[PDB]
Ligand binder design. Structure first.
Ligand code: HEM
Ligand code: HEM
Ligand SMILES: *[C@@H]1O[C@H](CO)[C@@H](O[C@@H]2O[C@H](CO)[C@@H](O)[C@H](O)[C@H]2NC(C)=O)[C@H](O)[C@H]1NC(C)=O
Ligand SMILES: *[C@@H]1O[C@H](CO)[C@@H](O[C@@H]2O[C@H](CO)[C@@H](O)[C@H](O)[C@H]2NC(C)=O)[C@H](O)[C@H]1NC(C)=O
Ligand code: D72
Ligand code: D72
Ligand code: BOG
Ligand code: NAG
Ligand code: NAG
Lengths: 552, 552
């Protein structure tokens, strides 16, 4: 009965009920006017005629390698291009943030309460006749049916971009500092109150936890030595809370910032590497600053490791995921003459789209061995047995799975894919197509257009009946990929805005933070500005093994 | 010890030790270079020649009323001037914030921990030889001596700008939503985690307190009716905690957003007015929106009151306080094509400069009664006896004290004035002249330049010896006022940047919030954009008594 249930306002206009069964669209600064904000203003008409499609842009960015080679070596051109991607991407995000799972209208509660994930689109009102608003049936199709018919792996589909397991575990490790759903509260709530790249997954969310992880000598984090190699310390040494099944022996209960990182040896690999990187940066800072005390060594190192992280995420991780020949750049100076909000609130939909469980192989391959899921999970003896070097060498060789294209979620994790479907519904997400318009994409007109084939498309039609009723999460995993690419259109177009805002929103990117003295001088500043996935592994893993995010 | 103890880096350069006995300045984006950032850039030399002093500017803005009359009646110019004041003042504030009482260098802890007040200048480090760095004696002069010789009132000195008790109590009430020192932790800590104009003093800091204060019908706040007049509910009725001495009867224990507001009838006056205003806007929104539930009516009203609050503070309060003939304007649209961070962190120094107790008279005059402090404190009987209409009429007629100029702190509050001095020192504040530099002011070269007279200057010179050792807080209350002004230069030049950033940094001012739909349509939007202290009183106080921030 809520008259805004049909989601009638278009082009980012805001709907508001003006009576028990009438509505009004606020078209302020949409660039359109009219009842539904669909009548464009002159300048908008021109802008929309000169805007190429995302797929048009993807082609140009993934072809003409010789030209981009030249462009990449003309700094002012490279800077101009990257400046434009940063600002044009980021305008797609609401900042300061607006809606959440409980608020489909702006409120001081939705603004102020940091425990919520925010919402790119408001939730469908409780009193709407259907789950998606007014379209479709009274109930969405059975999530188990959806799961089994179009999401579950039959045969492993390797990523055509050649993403490796160093990449898969990096994505998991990196994102789990800002994806930390509070299950005590509900799926639309977070325990990552920093809402960004604060490295709480290394240092801990709270000061108490951080202080138990710290050595209070030379700015360092506690560690232990086992077989001559540096690993994180134990729960017994540090007294910090971790999630471990009851049978894990005390000596293998490792303590790190993130409480769930001891449950996957690939996560524990990165926790070790970064802890190692933190202590290494303390030694460099102490060399430069014998006057400095423990506190400042610790704090400055943390700032540097945050910079290293954003640097690597942009120039290696996103570089690889995008497939672009254009050389992406981490340079905060790009935004200083530009309008940008140095803040971020993590979006629920960003959490949802980052569920890339199809990346996971059917087995994990370290040296001679091939480990099943049951063997791999909660099992840090494997890390100790093989060591980091072999972990890196092995995971650099092992191909990850393709994410879009359908039917490639491993069964070992099928409950996690079911919960993604079920919790999107619980949180009253709007439909795939509503989210496509939200990020200026053309709605799909059929399931065949979505999938780019006929079989999964036909199964989806039998379940959903109407393309307008298709759900975001399953669409992302079933969408037609770009040519020989890991993702489809929707993943990139919603993902790129959330991601870059979170990276460039950090306070260290603000002009008052982004200078040498923030990071202990030019030596500290250089560490950020020369950081790479290769150098991270080379400085902290014995024998400086080669590494990359793609299978070589 | 620390080589940065002498504050060597000028012009906002940042100082960093580079060894036990050496420093380096980071001159990044200061407009200067050289060892101490004192060598101006070509472009910088030009601006320093063309830039007039704040006093030259103050004269212009407070004279030529005929010329201002015309400017004020030309929308585009008025807007253009107000745009410039906003942007030019806001660039004085670090945003994202930087330092706090425990961190004199940037750290994630000082960024992320919302329980600190931030700092416009870092603290003087613990190992410095003197309180101010290196200058002065090993101890600052006895605070009691400073207080007695130059701060305490002999004879009430009236504000020549004619500020009244309506103004004085608006200031206390408004500011006490964001100045809420957490004495459990210490003077450098706040309970006002919203760090701005969130109206927690009406609605409560925590969800639990808000809920106790809410009626849960039609978006309203609980109230009671005494003698046909609306007042806040009691502690007993709502179980919300208030600070009252034990002898206060239960029927006078009023429960409002801010726990300390029962301490003064003047605060409770405004608490009643604003409670009435919230419930008034609920009625307005209920009329327009019969479809709406209690949550939305409550949330939407709060966003309108925050709007009303910012409107009145700029166009009534700051207008009066500035003494300007130019007509200031609350218009978020002014910043949309400018660079501006929609966030704020409340500074310790802003709290310190806002200790305007010289405003208080020796007795509070209502109707025909002259109440002493003892009689007035924690005495809501006074409010119920006289009523709101009489309070407004009385407080409108009673003049407040001048703040700068010296010797006007009421003796009844001397322990508060001594504390401001003692806490500044505990928080390791830099000197008056450092703060002047920080805010583009010329350092004072004698106590006579500071005071504009000889007697207090000489008292001050015997106590402090060096002008460079002089403290911020006492200086503000002894400073030579502008001609017939309530304040001296330093108060305005530090206070304006902090004030306007807090106002405009609110998210309701951001592009995506500032549209009709946020406030329930044009009718609610209109409530913000026509608000005034007069209309606040007229809509909510019986008989629509005339009011103003100045004596008639
Ligand atoms: C390596 C084996 C992995 C296992 C066993 C695993 C398993 C899980 C589990 C059990 C959950 C919690 C589900 C729930 O409580 O509803 C989860 C959530 C999640 N997974 Fe994975 N996952 C793996 C790898 C990955 C990878 C490579 C990614 C790629 C980024 C990823 C992304 C996510 C995200 C973003 C969440 C939401 C977490 C939160 O919000 O707290 N996972 N996964
Ligand atoms: C009406 C009579 C007033 C009394 C009895 C009074 C008394 C006090 C006291 C006792 C404190 C210390 C609070 C504490 O340490 O917990 C204080 C602080 C303060 N006063 Fe007043 N004051 C009055 C009026 C005003 C006025 C008119 C202003 C002008 C804005 C003002 C501004 C402040 C500020 C900004 C603080 C610091 C608050 C904090 O850090 O939480 N006061 N006052
Ligand atoms: C942020 O929002 C959540 C949801 O309203 C608040 O959590 C609830 O608080 C109430 C009352 O204090 C409890 O009865 C609920 O059980 C809480 N949880 C949930 C899931 O409803 C939370 O307190 C808010 N946080 C802040 C800091 O205001
Ligand atoms: C912000 O900083 C303060 C001060 O460091 C923290 O307050 C202290 O917390 C510890 C517990 O970890 C106590 O032992 C102290 O007594 C606390 N108070 C003070 C005044 O030191 C506070 O925990 C921090 N807040 C956050 C969110 O980290
Ligand atoms: C979570 C995933 C989707 C994010 O990883 C990506 C991917 Cl896969 C693509 C782009 C992107 C990011 Cl961040 O951001 C930008 C880029 F690469 F140019 F910076 C972009 C563009 O075309 O503007 C495309
Ligand atoms: C906390 C107190 C000090 C704030 O009250 C003031 C005062 Cl007293 C003066 C100005 C000011 C504010 Cl806010 O801000 C601006 C104004 F008036 F133009 F908006 C200003 C200017 O010259 O730019 C001067
Ligand atoms: C009483 C009108 C003249 C004011 C003179 C102020 C000089 C400071 O005198 C001080 O006054 C304080 C408050 O009364 C007392 O507590 C101190 O004992 C006294 O030294
Ligand atoms: C874990 O791996 C180690 C080393 O291979 C070994 O103790 C055991 O086979 C594994 N445990 C489980 C439960 O698979
Ligand atoms: C409070 O004010 C009343 C008038 O309402 C007055 O009669 C009374 O004596 C005052 N109380 C105290 C404790 O001074």
């Amino acid at each position: 009965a809520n008259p805004c249930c049909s989601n009638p306002c278009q082009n980012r206009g805001e709907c508001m009920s003006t009576g028990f069964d009438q509505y009004k669209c606020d078209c302020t600064r949409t660039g359109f006017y009219g009842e539904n904000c669909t009548t464009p203003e002159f300048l908008t008409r021109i802008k929309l005629l000169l805007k190429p499609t995302p797929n048009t842009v993807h082609y140009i960015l993934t072809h003409f390698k010789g030209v981009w080679n030249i462009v990449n070596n003309i700094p002012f051109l490279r800077s101009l291009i990257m400046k434009y991607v940063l600002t044009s991407r980021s305008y797609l995000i609401d900042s300061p943030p607006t809606y959440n799972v409980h608020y489909g209208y702006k409120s001081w509660e939705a603004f102020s309460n940091l425990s919520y994930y925010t919402r790119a689109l408001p939730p469908v009102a409780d009193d709407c006749p259907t789950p998606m608003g007014v379209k479709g049936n009274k109930e969405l199709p059975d999530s188990k049916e959806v799961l089994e018919k179009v999401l579950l792996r039959r045969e492993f589909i390797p990523d055509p971009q050649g993403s490796n397991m160093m990449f898969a575990f990096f994505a998991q490790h990196f994102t789990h500092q800002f994806f930390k759903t509070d299950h005590k509260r509900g799926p639309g709530f977070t325990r990552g109150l920093g809402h960004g790249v604060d490295l709480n997954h290394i240092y801990g969310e709270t000061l108490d936890r951080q202080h138990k992880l710290r050595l209070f000598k030379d700015g360092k984090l506690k560690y232990q030595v086992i077989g001559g190699e540096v690993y994180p310390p134990t729960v017994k040494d540090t007294q910090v809370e971790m999630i471990y099944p009851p049978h894990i022996p005390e000596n293998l209960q490792f303590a790190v910032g993130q409480e769930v990182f001891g449950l996957v040896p690939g996560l524990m690999m990165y926790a070790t590497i970064w802890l190692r990187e933190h202590n290494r940066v303390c030694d460099i800072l102490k060399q430069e600053h014998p006057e400095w005390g423990d506190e400042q060594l610790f704090q400055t190192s943390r700032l540097i490791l945050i910079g290293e992280t954003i640097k690597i995420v942009i120039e290696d991780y996103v570089q690889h995921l995008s497939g672009y020949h254009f050389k992406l750049k981490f340079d905060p100076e790009l935004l200083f003459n530009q309008q940008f909000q140095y803040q971020n609130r993590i979006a629920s939909e960003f959490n949802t789209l980052y569920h890339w469980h199809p990346l996971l192989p059917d087995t994990f391959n370290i040296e001679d061995q091939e480990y099943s899921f049951k063997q791999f999970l909660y099992n840090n003896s494997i890390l100790l047995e093989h060591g980091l070097t072999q972990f890196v060498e092995s995971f650099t060789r092992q191909i990850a799975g393709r994410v879009a294209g359908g039917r490639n979620v491993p069964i070992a994790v099928q409950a996690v894919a079911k919960a993604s479907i079920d919790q999107s519904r619980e949180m009253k997400y709007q439909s795939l197509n509503e989210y496509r318009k939200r990020f200026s994409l053309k709605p799909y007109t059929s399931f065949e257009e979505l999938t780019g084939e006929k079989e999964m498309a036909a199964e989806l039609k039998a379940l959903y009946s109407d393309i307008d009723v298709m759900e975001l999460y399953p669409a992302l995993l079933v969408e037609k990929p770009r040519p020989d690419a890991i993702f489809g259109e929707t993943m990139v177009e919603l993902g790129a805005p959330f991601s870059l805002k979170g990276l460039m929103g950090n306070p260290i990117c603000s002009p008052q933070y982004w200078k040498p003295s923030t990071f202990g001088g030019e030596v500290g500043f250089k560490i950020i500005n020369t950081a790479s996935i290769q150098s991270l592994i080379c400085n902290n893993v014995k024998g400086c093994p080669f590494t990359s995010f793609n299978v070589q």
